[PDB]
């Protein structure tokens, strides 16, 4: 089942159950200036959940474009499950149904619409949420040995210091004994064997300025399921980067690098980064040294640095815009409309960074050759930031590849000294 | 080697190196209203480290009484071999004097030369962005590099606060051997009692200002801390802190009061831990109450009493453990001996007060657990036991933990908001 088929099947399943199918919001949130990028299907409905905005539907469903880079940027290429850019499939209840319907909707979709066998699924609840435990174990009657009760850090949510909060229940997919890791709640739960597929958030209480808890007047539901993780389940593959919607991207990156080794991790990094960078440019973000524009700059330049690692000879990053648009333009026409703008923007940024990347890498490679210890010193980090346009995390990501770190504190001291020279 | 011998040797080792040996401060901190109880040897020297207070010594050493029951290790007592509410922290301090090289050499010398601990039983970690500390350990001291880990800022970077001094830390661990569960620092099961953190060295190296800018600290400083009970267990060949010499008379007396012969029973160890924090807190001026420091004391007292109930003790018992505590540690802490009768009176009265509702409250709890479907004691039971029977939520939750149950905190909080409205 292709990713587009799964996205549509998800949305059709909830439309049939009376959910208003709504479009994704932009990656640049409007109703939330403090937030860098849209990181969940929840964001555009935040004011509805708060009761500050009225809409004429009390149940919705979306496929939401999200970026988590300000944070999953350092997991890209190192795990089978993390992206900067991903799509979150969500259903929402605005004071309509609550735990019982949300749980059955999700279990029905996974085990009946999608046909996933219950023996491959694992469920967690908040260890203080007896309603969700009772619904799962006594009503749905799931296998209790593939079940865990988890503390507040993973299974309790709050919109902020004030406002709605409540327990969460989560559904995981067991990729089997060939992948390293243990079930949720075990010491190696972080492994890629048991992948979190679907997160169900139950908005159940209100916390006020003084810290008091009260019942939420209209208990609400917000869920989110990563499209790529469920696509990997439905296509029988272990890694997100093996699904249909990444193949053209990885194949094109490979073609530009002149290699047939489709297992090279820099290809996956480049494939991930073009998705976040292209979609961000199409939502209006432009490279700069501040705010949202610097996050984009940081991600572009890191993709370029990985092309350097692969030995790519000519400006390349902008060339992945077209296969992305061909692959996702049906679902995201704003990509097709802005294709030319996105290509120009990415090309210019790569050309601008190329005037210092080669020299900066020579300094980096020389430093790695002569270094004693495992820490790149702060003055070198600052030299690369200040003269050669290397963001600190770009330098740190290169250092990671040679079992090295970078002196963040030493870099910060260099920055204060520079303010002192001004 | 007894705990008192280790305490004295530690202080004498640093006194020879020109450290002024200073007394422990109180568990109730001065010039620091935000902090609940003194929780580290640093607390009394904080203003010296900040340059706000002048003293006529630039290096010191103390054995500091500490309590960690807030802001917090109360829920680890009895469940790990290594955690207390009350413990003594052995520290040496440099006030802009020596720095990383001497601190590391002082620490290694004391463990491997004074105390004779084999290097094959020690494990060292550094901040993974601290090349100076790595170089000193690996190139100068020349420790075995396979018993060494480079750890990120969560475990090995320290800061006094959002502004003020900060810097990297290096830590020394002891390997209790293959019969204990756990892995080395940095491994997935680094938690667990096999590799126990013995000594923490804090290097005050930078200053962070209001806006988050770092500058070099004008006079780099050192603050260290090593738990007396953990090193005593190493030096006495035992796995659990509670098996060391300084806990034996306490656990033995508690066992006699409970009529049991199992000197390792975990509720005995909890009772032995709690009398140390409760007695020393009362001796430092704290009194049971429903607010602030007095409520933390009340909570620890009542949890000890509830554990006596679990062991079947029928007659008020908790205050009877002050006398063996004072006998065991009175040489080191004479204020305990002077305040002994007052401590016993306060602890006795508090138990008699809780006893007016403890039995009835437990019947409600035991009946609730017998008929309970699910794993969560509901919020209205939690609020009833709190509001009518004086059961702190963590007391009720600690009972529930023993039956693999949890407690509805959110539901309890909702009940509390409703009660405030009835006012
Ligand atoms: N960076 C990412 N890359 C790929 N998929 C992701 C990423 N972040 C989240 N997902 C997917 O989206 C789903 C919903 O994410 P969401 O943030 O709501 O859950 P979560 O991270 O468990 O939340 P919480 O941290 O509040 O417990 C996840 O279950 C996962 O399938
Ligand atoms: N056609 C392909 N052949 C090989 N690797 C690919 C291909 N397409 C993508 N990759 C990426 O290369 C990564 C590493 O593959 P590797 O050969 O090291 O392990 P593998 O046998 O594919 O195991 P797994 O499927 O669990 O990753 C994969 O996880 C995947 O993201
Ligand atoms: N609750 C406790 N019970 C017994 N010993 C303790 C307790 N807390 C700390 N110690 C001992 O005191 C030493 C110093 O404590 P300290 O808090 O400085 O180290 P830490 O816990 O690593 O702190 P940080 O994580 O802030 O660096 C520890 O190495 C440990 O041996």
Coordinates of C-alpha atoms and ligand atoms in Angstrom, one line a residue, chain A residues 179 238-239 241-242 247 250 262-264 268, ligand 2:
Chain A
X179 CA 15.8 -5.2 14.8
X238 CA 12.1 -1.6 8.7
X239 CA 13.2 2.0 7.9
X241 CA 13.7 5.7 4.2
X242 CA 12.7 2.5 2.5
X247 CA 12.8 6.0 -3.3
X250 CA 17.4 8.5 -2.5
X262 CA 21.9 3.0 -1.5
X263 CA 22.8 2.3 2.1
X264 CA 25.0 5.3 2.5
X268 CA 19.2 9.5 3.6
Ligands
LIG2 N1 17.6 -0.4 -2.1 C1 18.3 -0.2 -1.0 N2 19.3 -1.1 -0.6 C2 20.0 -1.0 0.5 N3 19.8 0.0 1.4 C3 18.8 0.9 1.2 C4 18.0 0.9 0.0 N4 17.1 1.9 0.1 C5 17.3 2.6 1.2 N5 18.4 2.0 1.9 C6 18.9 2.5 3.2 O1 20.1 1.9 3.7 C7 20.0 1.6 5.1 C8 21.1 0.6 5.6 O2 21.0 -0.7 4.9 P1 21.9 -1.9 5.4 O3 22.2 -2.7 4.1 O4 23.0 -1.4 6.2 O5 20.9 -2.8 6.3 P2 19.6 -3.7 5.8 O6 20.0 -5.1 5.5 O7 18.9 -2.9 4.7 O8 18.7 -3.7 7.1 P3 17.4 -2.7 7.4 O9 16.4 -3.0 6.3 O10 17.0 -3.1 8.8 O11 18.0 -1.3 7.3 C9 18.6 1.1 5.2 O12 18.1 1.2 6.6 C10 17.8 2.0 4.3 O13 17.4 3.2 4.9

